[PDB]
Each structure stands twice: as C-alpha cells, then as structure tokens.
From a paper:
[name] is a highly conserved, homodimeric enzyme that reversibly converts isocitrate (ICT) to α-ketoglutarate (αKG) through NADP+-dependent oxidative decarboxylation. Tumor-driving [name] mutants catalyze a NADPH-dependent conversion of αKG to the oncometabolite D-2-hydroxyglutarate (D2HG), while typically ablating the conventional reaction. D2HG competitively inhibits αKG-dependent enzymes like TET2 and JmjC lysine demethylases, causing DNA and histone hypermethylation and cellular de-differentiation. We identified one mutant, [name], that maintained weak conventional catalytic activity, drove robust D2HG production, and was resistant to mutant [name] inhibitors via a mechanism not yet understood.
While [name]:NADP(H) showed no major global structural alterations upon alignment with previously solved structures of WT:NADP(H)13 and R132H:NADP(H)30, local shifts were observed. Unsurprisingly, NADP(H)-bound [name] had the typical open, inactive conformation seen in WT and R132H, with a larger active site cleft and smaller back cleft relative to the quaternary complexes. These distances in the binary [name] structure more closely resembled binary WT than R132H, supportive of a more closed, catalytically competent ground state for [name]. In particular, the clasp domain and helices proximal to the substrate and cofactor binding site were shifted, with the α1, α2, α4, α5, and α11 helices adjusted upwards and inwards in [name] versus WT and R132H, resulting in a similar shift of the NADP(H) molecule itself in dimer-based alignments. Importantly, this inward shifting of the α1 helix is a feature of closed, catalytically competent [name] conformations. [name] also contained longer, more intact β strands in the clasp domain, which plays a major role in maintaining the dimer, compared to WT and R132H. [name] [name] also maintained an extensive hydrogen bonding network enveloping the NADP(H) molecule; this network was far less robust in R132H. Together, dynamic and static structural data suggested that the [name] [name] active site pocket and surrounding features have greater rigidity and more defined structural features typical of fully-substrate-bound forms of [name], suggesting a more catalytically primed state for [name]:NADP(H) compared to R132H:NADP(H). We now believe that the more activated, quaternary-like state of the binary [name]:NADP(H) complex helped drive inhibitor resistance. Instead, our alignments showed residues 111-121 in the inhibitor binding pocket, which form a loop between the β4 and β5 strands, likely had a larger role in the loss of affinity towards inhibitors for [name].
Author numbering:
A (entry chain B): 3 to 271, 286 to 414
B (entry chain A): 4 to 271, 286 to 414
The structure:
C-alpha cells in the first residue's frame, strides 16, 4: 500500500501551472503517498469570490502545519481586473503569505548533466537567498528641487540627545535623495533562516556584504550573523563538516565562478522551468515550497486554443519534493523521505536520458535548430516521468 | 611608420606586464611612433614612489586625453607581506577614476566560433554604469534602540523645508542610511551614454526600477530624455539609432530575445575577452584597459618556467580603443585605419581557429582540450604579429 505522509498544506493556482499541478498530484504523488491534505484553492476566481479570505486561511494553515506547497497564482493588475471582472486589485498571494509567515526565500536551479550551465564546473547548485525586502518595507525617496541641505536624524525614544547626519549639501542645482532602514529583528531572522537552510542541506554558508563601503549598515549584517553563528550554530556546523564565512561581494563572485557549487549564498542587496523556491522561516520548522516561475500565461493561451504545449513541470514537481522531504524530516518518516528523493532523481534522470520539454531541448540544440522530435509535450513528459517513477520504485524494493 | 601623437601608457604587474610589453614590441611599435608618456605602475614602483607615480599618471591622462593601462596589483594583507609594502596602497584604478570622473563602459569582444551566454548574441552589448567618486558616499549609521529616523530637506533660503519619516523603530534598533545623487552626475552619465551610442552607431537603452523608487529613478529617466530630446535625437535619427527607457525586468527580457548591438546604461565567455573604457564627461578624455586582473595564477606558472596560455585580446583592445580615440581627436586617418586593422586581425585570427587555451576550453570543455587545440601566450602573439603584417601589407596595394 501507500506511504503515510502526514499533514501538508497545498495551495492550488492558476492557468498553465494549475493544469500541471493536478497532473503532478494525480500521476506522481497520489499513487504513492496518502496525505492529511489541507487544500486551499488560490485560483483567481476563488480569491475574488471569498474576498481573498482563502489566501489568509492558507497562510494560517501553513503556520499551523509547518509544510506548504504552493502553485503559481495570478497577481492581479489592471488588465487582470478587466479579464476576470475582479472586485478589487487583490494583493499578491505570495506577499500576503510571506507577511504572515516571515522567513527568507532561497532559490535553487536544478542541474542536469546534459543541460549547459553558466559555469561549466558547477556540478552542485548554488542556493541563493536574498534578504527579504518585504511588502510593508518602503524606502523614502524624494526630489531635491534646488540648493540646500539634506540631513537624516535619529531621535531616541529614551529621551537622550538626537543625532544628526549630513547626507549632502547641494550647493548648486538639485538632484534626489533617499533614506532606508532595517530592523535588527529582520537581520536576525535572515541569519537564522540561512543557518537552518545550510544545516538542512548540509552545505557551507557564505554571507556577502559591502561592509567596506557601508561600514555601519552592512557591518550590522556581518556582526549579527557572526554573533548568532558562534553562539548557536558553530558546533552544529562543525558536526557536519560545514562552516559559515563572511565574504566581500567581490571575492564572492570570484570564488563562485571558480567553485564546484554546493553552498548557500546569502546576500543583502537558465530555464525558469528548472528554478525552485522555498520560504524558510527562522524557526527552522516552517517552510513553503513553490516554483520560482509564474503561471506561464503564454503557454496557457496556447492550451486554451487547443494547441500543443511543452511546459516544463520540474520546478513544480520539486516544490512537492522539497515540501514532502521537509515533512519527512519533521516526522522522522524514512519512507516518505526516500520517496521524495527518488522522485527528484527520476525527474533529473529522465532529462539526462534525453527525454525533456522544449525549453530544455532549446538549451541543448539552440532554439533555431530544435525539432519536434527533440522534445516531449507537457503530457508526454508527465507520462514518461510517471513510468520512470514506477520503475524506480520497483527497483528500490529488491 | 605612423606618426601617432600623445599617448599616456601605464605599465602594470605580473602576467599582464609581460603581455603588455609583447604587445608594444610586436604589434604597436613596429608600425606606430608615439610621443609616449609612460608611467610605471608596477607594485614595486608605486611602493617606492609612495604611490606618487599613480597620481602623476592620472594628471597626464587629464592633460593628454588618452590613457591605456595595464592591469595592476591592488594590495591586500597578503601582498603587503609578499612585497614588504610600506602601506596597503589604494587601487590605482580607484585613484585614477577619482581624478578623472566619467562613466565606465564594459564590452565583450565577440568571435563567432566562441560560445556565448545567449547563443543569439552576434553584435556587442556595451554596458555602462557611472563612476561616482569617493565623495559619493551614503551616510549610514547604527540605530541603537527605539526611536524615529527622519530625513529632511532644507532649501538654501530656509523656506519650503520638508521632513519625511523614514521609520519609527518601535521594538528595537537596527540601521539606517541616507544617500543622494546630484543632477550634474546624472547629466554626466547621460552625456557619456548618448555619445557612446553615437561613437559606435548602436541604440542606447537606460534601465531603472522607477516603479519602486518613483522619485529617485524617475529623475534619471526624466533627465536622460530631456538631454536626448534637446541635444541628440537629431543626430540619433541620422544614424537610424534611438534612445529608450525600459524597466530592468523588461530590459533583461528583450536583451536575451535580441541579437545584441546596443548600449545599455544601468542605474544600479572569458575574462580575457572583456574590455573596459572610462569615458569622461568632457567628451574628450578616455582611459582604456582590460576588464581582468594581472592573471596571478598564470604568472606563478611562468615564474616556474612552465608554459602558459594567457589571452592578450582585452589588453590589445585597450591599445586599439586608446589609439582609435587619439586618431579621432587628431583626425589621424592612418592611425584610425591601423587601430581598426588590429582589432580585425585579432578577431580574424581566433575565428580562423588560432586561439589561447581559455577559448579552446570554451569550445571543447576543459577536460577535452588537447595541446594542439590552442597556442601558448608567445605563439599566439607571434601568430597575431604575422597576420598583422599581412593585413597591413595587403591594404597598401
Ligand atoms: N509565484 C507566483 O505565483 C508567480 C506569479 N506570477 C504570475 O504569472 C503570470 C504570468 O507571469 P509571466 O510574466 O508570464 O512569467 P512566467 O514565469 O509565468 O512565464 C514567463 C515565461 O518564461 C518561460 N517559462 C516560465 N515557466 C516555464 C516553464 N515552467 N516551462 C517552460 N517555460 C517557462 C516562458 O517563456 P516563453 O514565453 O519563451 O515560452 C513563459 O512564457 C502573471 O499573472 C504573474 O502574476 C509570476 C511570477 C510568480
Ligand atoms: N584593473 C586591475 O588592475 C585589476 C586588478 N586586479 C588584480 O589582479 C590580481 C589577480 O586578480 P585575480 O583575482 O587573479 O583575477 P584575474 O582576473 O587577474 O585572473 C583571474 C582568472 O581569470 C582567468 N583569466 C583572467 N584574465 C585572463 C586572461 N587574460 N587570459 C586567460 N585567462 C584569464 C584565469 O582563470 P584560470 O585560473 O581559470 O586560468 C585567471 O586566473 C590581483 O592582485 C588583483 O588586485 C584584478 C582585477 C582588475
């Protein structure tokens, strides 16, 4: 019988990814895994009908059950408001979910030996996480119409003396100026998420800053990461033969173009079908996995007109496998953990054996010289994955 | 020989120092006589002169309008030890760009037999960002606890002050900063860009994120257009080239979908193929160099008597970009022809299958290159020298 998988929050989406999402469940997940599935429909029509309440409920569910897997969704704009006759221009579901969960987003390209890469030496991927700039963040920028002083001041709540910094004296002409800020707590959450990410994947962790220029702003990221590491993670890192190190952003871009890959890169600041995303909350317990791409509207329109499509499902499949692998980790569920690994290997192996969608065939041959016999359409490719998955799991039972 | 005029030359360090002398000996000096202002920016000489030679080199470029620079060591702690330096001298490139100002444009040289990132790129993409000197700093500080951070603009006459709340720290501290740009720096950026797209005959695109920074980036967009509509749109349409603003997201898109051939002004294969040019606001002064370092790892092999294969292309194009600009300022037609002929010979040689190991590895993959697929540093220079002799001979008859 099937693997007992536990509690998973699933979020259905829109357009081409909604189609692929249901194929993934039907052909690759549901035949092998039984889940206590908390399923929320974030399709644009349901978000409109529920006044976006379904989106906030999904976020709350992810908070409670720790594991979310999300399908790409339409973020409305004025054209979408017309297309769907929306009540309002609903905010992005990803923005709403992130604001409720906090955490840092890590992006990871899936590597196939036969698919050309930027750096030829990159055997293992680089997992990049950017300091979340949030949706309630806002820099304060304005036009400087003419000569005068721009100053930035800090007034302590504790009543001690106010501090004034000259930003620039405009002696002739005008220009622009702005102020930015970050709270210690965001930086701490960023450090924790990054340390947990590195511990989970078993790779070393690099933070890059410009603390040679922004000695105080970037110095704070550097210091807070270092303090949290030494005090809470160093021994854990050593236990797994990994490390954490700060790097100047220049030394980083070098170190990486010459490296083999296989590390986590946090910074402050290739086919989209192979890019995964995961929201890692600072608690180390809660994650939300998704494809890094959108709903592939262009393909969806072809699908509506009954034309043949070739949409890459890999990023969407890995959203499931990262979600299930984290669930297996929380529950100490060995069988689910093997399943999630096996499905990742089947996906990669299928491409590496020469069965792939048109985006990948074009990477290999060049778009001008791709032929229909070089690639599989969306449904043929899912069918091939499904057959290779069955073979892989029968081999595992020997 | 061609009478070439005044060129400021800066000698450098390690592997690039050796290639640089080979370029002069085999490719330049046999055909061009220069009133040569040479500054030795080798690390030993900068240490001995207390970095004065670097400041004199910058002044010479300011005076003579054309500089060509070999790559130089930027000291770190290990270099201090290696050379017993008196100080951690600052980067010579920083010092020079601080004195000269201007915009840095980077450009990969394209050889049709060398794989590129986007296989569709057949014409050059030239990326410019503005060099804001050391006086262009942000003002950043630690916020030690709860309190209010405000940014205020006070006009010179005292009226029409505005105070903007940046953030109310309610539960702890953090960091904050202010930054600025003067209209003059943006106008300089815009002029360098418009005049690069003209000097080269390609369309110019500016990209911003003015959807977020509505005011800050709006100012770059508005000033670029203003300077265009009023000072360049005529000469632009005369060369069937255009200017256009685009959001970064869009730009990145259309860029891969295109075959290249544009100047990309940005509001923020092989290194041996990447060129750099600092273009000063004055439209007159230019500093050209390779967009790579001194190639230390190759120099260590050379020091042990081991064969090397170091690509000279970027260093050669520092010379041809410099000499082409010198030719433009002096209306020197023989010089202009020479500089272009050297670029053609360089590209032609590689496209004929004669290349250094880095390019051979791009084609074959590093585990697959065999010795017969490439030439070492000295063989490649000789091949170029021979093809240059032929190219210039045939142009006479
Ligand atoms: N997390 C989310 O929920 C996301 C939401 N979106 C939503 O997605 C919708 C469309 O956004 P769009 O701008 O089209 O960006 P998409 O990423 O959805 O698609 C962009 C293009 O990238 C290529 N591409 C992306 N994913 C794949 C894939 N899996 N297989 C093959 N090719 C792929 C296609 O290029 P080609 O055209 O060359 O085939 C596709 O047209 C919008 O409504 C947007 O709001 C977008 C961002 C993220
Ligand atoms: N403008 C300047 O003066 C510059 C100064 N530097 C200085 O250069 C020194 C070394 O810098 P480094 O970090 O080694 O970076 P480099 O750019 O000097 O060399 C880095 C690597 O890139 C490849 N490479 C670079 N140029 C060539 C070339 N012309 N032909 C073939 N391969 C090339 C080699 O890779 P492989 O090892 O794979 O063969 C080389 O080891 C430092 O002292 C630094 O300060 C660095 C940048 C700019």
């Amino acid at each position: 019988k099937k693997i007992s998988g536990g509690s998973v929050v699933e979020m259905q989406g829109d357009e081409m990814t909604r189609i692929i999402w249901e194929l993934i469940k039907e052909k690759l997940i549901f035949p092998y895994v039984e889940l206590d599935l908390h399923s929320y429909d974030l399709g644009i029509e349901n978000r409109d009908a529920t006044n976006d309440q379904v989106t906030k409920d999904a976020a709350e569910a992810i908070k409670k059950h720790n594991v979310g897997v999300k399908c790409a969704t339409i973020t409305p704009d004025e054209k979408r408001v017309e297309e769907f006759k929306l009540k309002q221009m609903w905010k992005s579901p990803n923005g709403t979910i992130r604001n409720i969960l906090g955490g840092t987003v890590f992006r990871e390209a899936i590597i196939c030996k036969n698919i050309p890469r930027l750096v030829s030496g990159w055997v293992k991927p680089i997992i990049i996480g950017q300091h979340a700039y949030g949706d309630q963040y806002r820099a304060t920028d304005f036009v400087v119409p003419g000569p005068g002083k721009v100053e930035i001041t800090y007034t302590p709540s504790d009543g001690t003396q106010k501090v004034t910094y000259l930003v620039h004296n405009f002696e002739e002409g005008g220009g622009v100026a702005m102020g930015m800020y970050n709270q210690d707590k965001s930086i701490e959450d960023f450090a924790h998420s990054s340390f947990q990410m590195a511990l989970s994947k078993g790779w070393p962790l690099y933070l890059s800053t410009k603390n040679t220029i922004l000695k105080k702003y970037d110095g704070r990221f550097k210091d807070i990461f270092q303090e949290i590491y030494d005090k809470q993670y160093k021994s854990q890192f050593e236990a797994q033969k990994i490390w954490y190190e700060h790097r100047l952003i220049d030394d980083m871009v070098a170190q990486a173009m010459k490296s083999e890959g296989g590390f986590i890169w946090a910074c402050k600041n290739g086919s989209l079908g192979m890019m995964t995303s995961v929201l890692v909350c600072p608690d180390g317990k809660t994650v939300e996995a998704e494809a890094a791409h959108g709903t592939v509207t262009r393909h969806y329109r072809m699908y509506q007109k009954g034309q043949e499509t070739s949409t890459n499902p890999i990023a969407s499949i890995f959203a499931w496998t990262r979600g299930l692998a984290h669930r297996a980790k929380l529950d100490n569920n060995k069988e689910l953990a093997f399943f999630a690994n096996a499905l990742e290997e089947v996906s990669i192996e299928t491409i590496e054996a020469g069965f792939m969608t048109k985006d990948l065939a074009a990477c290999i041959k060049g778009l001008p010289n791709v032929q229909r016999s070089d690639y599989l359409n969306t449904f043929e490719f899912m069918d091939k994955l499904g057959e290779n998955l069955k073979i892989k799991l029968a081999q595992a039972k020997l």
